[PDB]
């Protein structure tokens, strides 16, 4: 159906394997999977900002950016360590001894309604498994609430498909 060239990445949501995903210190009442979609519950930590999020990609894609934010209360992740090409997963000790592939200090503008975290695709040229460990928050809160989480980018090599239409617009 026609064709065109423009800047339009994908959240890779449908490319994530929720069946192979893994969460650390996940609340009992709240799930770490409900914070993946915009329309769902939130993920509240029952300890502190020391939760981990594993992601298993069935196909090797490219992490050009990451959308990490929280609820509308004032609790969002700031200093998060990103890991890729892991042997299977990331723990609390393994996330401390070993350094992340990127790791950035998310700001209020990165965890807002349209917050965006520009990563370095140069390192995620081809990743099959990515993990994110929460260290600190925006205002050093006691806990980080996750509401929306995804990976912006594109597959290293896919077919000629089509999607993503309509959307908001401002002056």
UniProtKB/Swiss-Prot annotation:
Which residues does the UniProt record annotate as the domain PITH?
8-165
Predominant subcellular localization, coarse grouping: cytoplasm
Q: Where expressed (tissues)?
A: Ubiquitous.
Q: Per its record, what are the GO molecular function terms?
A: disulfide oxidoreductase activity; protein-disulfide reductase activity
Assigned keywords, A-Z: Cytoplasm, Disulfide bond, Electron transport, Nucleus, Phosphoprotein, Proteasome, Redox-active center, Transport
The free-text function statement in the UniProt record for this protein reads: Active thioredoxin with a redox potential of about -250 mV.
Subunit and interaction comment = Component of the 19S regulatory cap of the 26S proteasome. Interacts with PSMD14/RPN11. Interacts with, and reduces EEF1A1.
Q: Could you tell me what this protein is called?
A: Thioredoxin-like protein 1
Supply the source organism for this entry: Homo sapiens (Human)
Q: State which stretch of the full-length protein is shown.
A: 122 to 279 of 289
């Amino acid at each position: 159906g026609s064709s065109g060239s423009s800047g339009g990445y994908m959240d890779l949501m449908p490319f994530i394997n929720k069946a192979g995903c893994e969460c650390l210190n996940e609340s009992d009442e709240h799930g770490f999977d409900n914070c993946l979609r915009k329309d769902t519950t939130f993920l509240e930590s029952d300890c502190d900002e020391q939760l981990l999020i594993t992601v298993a990609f069935n196909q090797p894609v490219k992490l050009y950016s990451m959308k990490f934010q929280g609820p509308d209360n004032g609790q969002g992740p700031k200093y998060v360590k990103i890991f890729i090409n892991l042997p299977r997963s990331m723990d609390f000790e393994e996330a401390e001894r070993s350094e992340p592939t990127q790791a950035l200090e998310l700001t209020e503008d990165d965890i807002k309604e349209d917050g965006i975290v520009p990563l370095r695709y140069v390192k995620f040229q081809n990743v099959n498994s990515v993990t994110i460990f929460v260290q600190s928050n925006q205002g050093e809160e006691e806990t980080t609430r996750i509401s929306y989480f995804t990976f912006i980018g594109t597959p290293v090599q896919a077919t000629n498909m089509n999607d993503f239409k309509s959307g908001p617009s401002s002056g």
